Design a protein around this ligand. Structure first.
Ligand code: FCA
Length: 305
């Protein structure tokens, strides 16, 4: 009866696919229809809201393709008597200050970034790399808070663990995907012939994967590369390959939680003016590798591997 939207910036990522899946679940439970829309850019975002209004949706969950669209999104929604909840990516104002007023569901970015770093360092030690000939490549998306806090967290952890600060090289990526990250990593690789072993730091699976792909192209074998993604669900195809690669593992979050919970809260809000908490931080994480990925997915009920 009631129709609620679930707008995602990147429909191609398993992460977002899963959030859609679990929105559908909440829909069945509570008795609402979820309208699933891809919003890969600003225009499509604004158009999509119009479209929702036409369909008579009461509200929407959104992961905006651009945090800086926040103001506009709110203005449009307001106009249509729509309630908004942000998932994953927080709205910011013109100045890049967060819009605290919009309820947000997100991962504990910093904490998860830090776990990445810890796990990078641990695996390095396991392999017995000489620090003197090792480096960290940090592929950054500093314009996105959530991404920033992951990669910063990771670098902080590595530094805390005793990885030499001066051997940490950052490079911005133009896009938060494989192609973008590849390009970025490549440009950094050719700058540093002296490095024999790389740690790859990136905010998510795709970013790290791009990094890994570049290293391979520059004649690094798996043993000499450690990349640990974040998302988990996005990494399955990699972890499924016959042969081990530079991509060691991924930190599996809870896209299920993000999808279901964001939806359920909106409904309660729309249906019963039950005001959501402003901020919901999801702290779940588990390292999945070649050995355990299958169990851990099935254990979290994201079956298939
Ligand atoms: C938790 C999410 O954070 C951002 O939205 C990234 O772009 C996603 O791929 C995902 O990792």
């Amino acid at each position: 009866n009631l129709k609620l939207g679930f707008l995602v910036k990147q429909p191609e990522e398993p992460w977002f696919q899963t959030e859609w899946k679990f929105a559908d679940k909440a829909g069945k439970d509570l008795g609402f229809e979820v309208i699933k829309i891809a919003v890969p850019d600003g225009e499509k975002t604004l158009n999509a809201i119009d479209s929702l209004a036409a369909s008579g949706a009461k509200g929407f969950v959104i992961c905006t393709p651009d945090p800086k669209l926040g103001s506009a999104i709110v203005a449009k929604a307001r106009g249509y008597d729509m309630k908004v909840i942000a998932v994953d990516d927080q709205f910011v104002n013109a100045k890049g200050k967060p819009m605290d007023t919009v309820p947000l569901v997100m991962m504990a970015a910093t904490k998860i970034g830090e776990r990445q770093g810890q796990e990078l360092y641990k695996e390095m030690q396991k392999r017995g790399w000489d620090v003197k000939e090792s480096a960290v490549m940090a592929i950054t998306a500093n314009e996105l808070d959530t991404a920033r806090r992951r990669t910063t967290g990771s670098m902080d952890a590595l530094k805390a663990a005793g990885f030499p600060e001066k051997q940490i090289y950052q490079v911005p990526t133009k896009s938060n995907d494989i192609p973008g990250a590849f390009d970025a990593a490549n440009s950094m690789l050719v700058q540093h012939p002296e490095v024999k072993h790389w740690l790859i730091v990136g905010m998510n699976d795709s970013t790290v994967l791009g990094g890994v792909r570049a290293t391979e192209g520059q004649g690094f074998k798996a043993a000499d590369i450690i990349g640990i993604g974040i998302n988990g669900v996005d990494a399955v195809s990699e972890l499924s390959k016959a042969q081990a690669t530079g991509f060691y593992g991924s930190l599996l979050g809870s896209p299920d939680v993000h999808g279901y919970k964001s939806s359920e809260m909106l409904y309660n809000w729309v249906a019963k003016d039950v005001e959501p908490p402003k901020f919901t931080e999801v702290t779940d994480v588990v390292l999945i590798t070649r050995d355990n990925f299958k169990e851990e997915l099935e254990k979290k009920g994201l079956g298939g591997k």
